[PDB]
Design a protein around this nucleic acid. Structure first.
Lengths: 50, 54, 97, 78, 97
DNA sequence: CTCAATTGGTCGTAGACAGCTCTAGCACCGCTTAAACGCACGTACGCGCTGTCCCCTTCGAAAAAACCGCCAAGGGGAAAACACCCAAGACACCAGGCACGAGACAGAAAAAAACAACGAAAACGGCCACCACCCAGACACACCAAACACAAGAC
DNA sequence: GTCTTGTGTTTGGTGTGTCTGGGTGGTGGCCGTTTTCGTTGTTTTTTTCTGTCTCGTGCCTGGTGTCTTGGGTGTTTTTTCGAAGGGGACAGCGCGTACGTGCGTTTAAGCGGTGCTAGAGCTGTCTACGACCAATTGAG
């Protein structure tokens, strides 16, 4: 269903980007659904304590 | 042209209906007769598509 | 009971009258009108019944053509049908007064 | 040639025609309509010229063509 | 500063209705004429006066067409005239079939 | 400077024009009922708009990156709710065809009137002479047309 | 920057002029055969009628779908965008009451039957008139 495939790829794009950058502008921050934001690979090395 | 219209009207006698139908169906006759009014000719059956139900 | 939806009958009517070719105005009213107008130009004029019917054929065909033009004026923004502004417009495009 | 009827020329004409705002599509439409017009007028004029056996199209040929077309022009002889 | 778009347009209309000289460049029109006529007859000649008369008729025709079209646009309540307006115009004139 | 305007006159006939009728257009009644009116009603399409799209622009908005060193020791919570069913079912809203209302029209008989066929009058259409002036063609000028080239300029 | 302007000039094509003259169309008489109009018969169209088709409004049976739910494992400085100004085109969707479909009543259009008449058009008589003409003049 070409309708839903668009949303499927949009959500895959969200997960893959959030794997390497959780802090997208505007996009919902990926989380462990109990609150805590997901430390992306960027965040593993981004700043101090990288 | 009018006899053909009559025939497809299934009528043997050409009546002003048929003359008007012929004259307006042929674009060139319609240009020759564009200002002419034919008594009892009426109009071509034509409804604007806007008007037709969808 | 039964009721045709709006314009269903109107379309059926248009189909009808474009099939037919008779005079759509009732004759005697028209004849009286003609007599009235002519009286304004000149009293005591006798009208051949044929001459009347001719004026009627002309008037009907003219007004039908005018209505055609007017309905063509409806076209924009998928606006529908005809209003006096449309008549006035169509006439002025013709250059009628 | 036809594009020799430049966009500014058509603007100028439509301004004389009182047009405030112009869709660019109007330019090719104007060119097409003007072409059709000229076509008809010139065809009639040449048809007078042909009848006169002339090669020169005269101003009178144009006037008579316009007089036929219902476009009577004063200025070049009646 | 910047003139709000559409403010020079009215000024130009005022100028070009004041003016009366021909608005198409003379030679390009003349060449279009010679081209169109060639299609009907070879080795044609034109009197300069005949070309100017053609240009006069063509321009005045076009001006009247633009007028009518403008009125159609206004009936569309559009400031911008469009091809559909020209089509409606000519149609009501009965030029195009 | 000259030939288009002008005149008095004759010709003969166009049409004045006066009579004559009888075509058909005037009124008129009067019965039928199609159509007009008017009223109800409602729903759809004429009114409305600000959503937004287009050309050009800057420029100020979000974005986004950064912001002691390091070091000690608490005391929390990590939902798990409730997503997303799995699944089974009765529930709509969905078919679609039932079904016949109301009209259209198709097929028939019948009436009728349109119009085909026959016969008659007469003027238009053709044959011929003959007329002459119109138009063709020739021969010529010349001017106006195309053409070339440059200016300045419309684009 | 552009290749149109339009003046300036070139020169010869062809348009128009004038002249000749006999091919042609007009005029006329004459004939005649054609056309129109009037009468009679018929065949096609139209009317009323039957009837059945058909497509619309929407009723009806009950189907394709749905979404509740018993049980539950697991869902501060810098950049550059891309806003906004300045304006229309158009337009989705809301609002709402206009005018469509209906129906019941009223009208008078139509038929058509009948009377009347006036002036449409015909035909006959006369000559006022415009065309042709020769001789004359001066307006363009």
């Amino acid at each position: 269903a070409a309708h839903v495939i668009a949303e499927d790829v949009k959500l895959l794009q969200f997960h893959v980007a959030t794997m390497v950058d959780n802090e997208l502008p505007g996009l919902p921050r990926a989380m462990q659904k109990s609150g805590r934001p997901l430390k992306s690979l960027k965040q593993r090395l981004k700043g101090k304590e990288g | 042209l009018a006899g053909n219209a009559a025939r497809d009207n299934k009528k043997t006698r050409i009546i002003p209906r048929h003359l008007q139908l012929a004259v307006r169906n042929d674009e060139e006759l319609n240009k020759l007769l564009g200002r002419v009014t034919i008594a009892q000719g009426g109009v071509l059956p034509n409804i604007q598509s806007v008007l037709l139900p969808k | 009971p039964h009721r045709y939806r709006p314009g269903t009958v109107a379309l059926r009517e248009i189909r009808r009258y474009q099939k037919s070719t008779e005079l759509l105005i009732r004759k005697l009213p028209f004849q009286r009108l003609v007599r009235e107008i002519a009286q304004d130009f000149k009293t005591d004029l006798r009208f051949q019944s044929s001459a009347v019917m001719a004026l009627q054929e002309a008037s009907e065909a003219y007004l039908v053509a005018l209505f055609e033009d007017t309905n063509l004026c409806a076209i924009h923004a998928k606006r529908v049908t005809i209003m006096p502004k449309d008549i006035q417009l169509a006439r002025r495009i013709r250059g009628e007064r | 040639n036809i594009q020799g009827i430049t966009k500014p020329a058509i603007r100028r004409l439509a301004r004389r025609g009182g047009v405030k705002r112009i869709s660019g599509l109007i330019y090719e439409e104007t060119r097409g309509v003007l072409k059709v017009f000229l076509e008809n007028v010139i065809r009639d004029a040449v048809t007078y010229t042909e009848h006169a056996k002339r090669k020169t199209v005269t101003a009178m040929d144009v006037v008579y063509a316009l007089k036929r077309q219902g476009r009577t022009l004063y200025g070049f002889g009646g």
